[PDB]
Design a protein around this nucleic acid. Structure first.
Length: 71
DNA sequence: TTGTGTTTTACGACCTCC
DNA sequence: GGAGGTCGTAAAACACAA
């Protein structure tokens, strides 16, 4: 696990994760392992980041929908 | 400032998967 | 035979109108 209490990821670390997310919204066990290793993060952090990004996507989609219902 | 609204990490609870 | 999915939320970090 990781705690005390949350760490900020570097702009470069975020960038790579965003790219990879555009490549696929679900990361494979292998990919996860490549990415962790090259980014200096744990597999679990990568797991979780992918979970959060999908939640963010759901949240942005609901809003897109709420606007479209109103225009 | 500061306040107060939002975004980013990280969790636990609970659930699906032959 | 345990992994990863959602979800709601805590708290740190950031955005920025007043």
């Amino acid at each position: 696990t990781k705690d005390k209490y949350r760490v900020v990821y570097t702009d470069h670390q975020r960038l790579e994760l965003e790219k990879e997310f555009h490549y696929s919204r679900y990361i494979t066990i292998r990919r996860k392992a490549e990415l962790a290793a090259t980014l200096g993060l744990s597999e679990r952090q990568v797991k979780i980041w992918f979970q959060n990004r999908r939640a963010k996507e759901r949240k942005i989609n609901k809003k897109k929908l709420q606007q479209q219902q109103q225009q």
